[PDB]
Amino acid sequence: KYDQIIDAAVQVIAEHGYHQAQVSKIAKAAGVADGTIYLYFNNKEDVLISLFQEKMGRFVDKIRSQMNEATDVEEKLKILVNMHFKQLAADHKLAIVTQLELRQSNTELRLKINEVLKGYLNLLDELLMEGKEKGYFFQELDTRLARQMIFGTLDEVVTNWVMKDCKYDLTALVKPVHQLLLGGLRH
Amino acid sequence: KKKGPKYDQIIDAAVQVIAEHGYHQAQVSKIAKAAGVADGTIYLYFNNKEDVLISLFQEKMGRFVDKIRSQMNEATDVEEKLKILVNMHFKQLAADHKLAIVTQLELRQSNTELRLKINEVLKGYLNLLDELLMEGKEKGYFFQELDTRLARQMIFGTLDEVVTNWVMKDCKYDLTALVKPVHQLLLGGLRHR
Ligand SMILES: CCCCCCCCCCCCCCCC(=O)O
Ligand SMILES: CCCCCCCCCCCCCCCC(=O)O
Ligand SMILES: [Mg+2]
Numbered sequence: 001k002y003d004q005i006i007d008a009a010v011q012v013i014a015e016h017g018y019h020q021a022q023v024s025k026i027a028k029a030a031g032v033a034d035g036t037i038y039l040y041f042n043n044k045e046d047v048l049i050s051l052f053q054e055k056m057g058r059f060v061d062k063i064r065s066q067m068n069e070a071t072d073v074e075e076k077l078k079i080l081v082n083m084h085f086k087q088l089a090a091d092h093k094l095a096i097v098t099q100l101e102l103r104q105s106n107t108e109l110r111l112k113i114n115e116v117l118k119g120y121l122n123l124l125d126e127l128l129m130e131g132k133e134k135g136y137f138f139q140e141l142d143t144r145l146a147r148q149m150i151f152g153t154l155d156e157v158v159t160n161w162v163m164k165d166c167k168y169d170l171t172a173l174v175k176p177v178h179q180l181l182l183g184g185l186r187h
Numbered sequence: 188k189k190k191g192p193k194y195d196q197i198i199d200a201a202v203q204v205i206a207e208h209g210y211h212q213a214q215v216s217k218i219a220k221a222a223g224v225a226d227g228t229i230y231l232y233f234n235n236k237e238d239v240l241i242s243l244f245q246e247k248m249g250r251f252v253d254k255i256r257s258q259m260n261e262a263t264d265v266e267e268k269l270k271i272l273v274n275m276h277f278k279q280l281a282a283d284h285k286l287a288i289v290t291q292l293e294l295r296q297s298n299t300e301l302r303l304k305i306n307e308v309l310k311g312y313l314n315l316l317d318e319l320l321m322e323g324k325e326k327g328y329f330f331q332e333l334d335t336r337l338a339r340q341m342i343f344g345t346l347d348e349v350v351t352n353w354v355m356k357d358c359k360y361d362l363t364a365l366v367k368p369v370h371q372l373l374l375g376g377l378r379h380r
Pocket of ligand 2: 156159247248251276279280290291294295305306309347
């Protein structure tokens with residue numbers, strides 16, 4: 001019942017956009033009464049934020065599990081890149097939500113979205129610190145800048161794919177993005 | 188094609204109003220007051236708020252890219268040229284915090300057709316990036332098997348993300364102190380430097 005509301009919210013926000021999405025449309029798409037939505041969510045903002053928290057929480061947990069099992073820090077990065085691309089290539093509507101509708105100019109809304117994103121960003125920080133401690137990455141590497149390079153590059157590749165109607169295979173870019181982030185531009 | 192003489196004052200006012208009150212609350216009345224003009228003077232130049240926003244973005248990007256292109260043309264080394272590009276990106280926004288609020292926060296809108304127009308303006312800077320990468324490959328400075336498209340996305344996505352983070356921190360530190368480290372990081376990735 002909570003899960004069908006989450007699913008419906010993705011659908012409705014992707015189709016109509018966040019500002020034109022009404023919680024009543026979400027309830028109709030979920031097969032629930034207007035009132036069933038407010039048992040879980042104070043309102044429409046709490047719907048967008050909760051949907052993001054739910055999807056991010058599950059993503060981060062899966063990546064952490066898969067990484068905790070990997071043997072090599074470069075493979076841990078690959079896992080992260082692969083899961084980021086795979087999960088969105090699996091759900092075009094959630095990609096429209098992440099790439100397009102969670103990008104808000106409202107200051108209070110923007111700050112709440114960013115707080116949810118810190119879960120992913122902190123997992124990057126952990127990976128970067130691990131790679132510096134273990135010697136895969138250079139000692140002087142600036143963790144925060146590197147996080148911004150990794151997340152900013154991944155997010156930019158995904159956005160361009162969404163902007164091109166998801167018409168090529170996003171998952172075919174895992175290997176070259178991973179190689180580019182490890183090696184940089186230089187010959 | 189030349190601009191009328193009230194162009195700059197309207198667009199400069201628009202940057203101020205949009206940065207201060209945000210795009211949604213920005214109104215042509217407020218832009219006119221900040222520009223020192225009657226409302227009707229705005230509509231001689233621009234149809235509505237959106238038109239003010241895309242015009243300013245286009246005009247400014249065109250000059251930004253032209254300045255990069257000529258500073259780069261004076262260099263030899265394409266190491267230098269990438270450093271020129273990073274430095275001019277960060278410099279232009281560090282020189283105008285209100286324009287940075289506009290570019291990083293306010294010009295990020297879910298209006299599908301505004302979004303399309305903004306991307307078309309951005310393509311000019313992305314083509315410059317592509318030229319640099321092509322050059323660097325041809326002269327052996329960048330990895331020969333590099334995909335220009337992906338490399339462009341990494342450079343732009345990185346620079347944009349660094350600038351956004353500085354804007355979300357009220358522009359309180361000197362963004363141009365990150366020029367060298369971003370430059371180096373783009374060249375060596377996680378593994379090298
Ligand atoms: C199938 C698992 C679903 C989870 C997929 C979400 C993982 C990719 C999310 C990337 C985060 C991008 C959101 C950025 C938020 C913002 O800046 O507005
Ligand atoms: C004079 C302007 C200098 C600004 C430096 C470049 C700023 C570019 C930011 C505008 C981006 C528009 C939308 C983002 C697209 C994306 O990354 O997905
Ligand atoms: Mg970005």
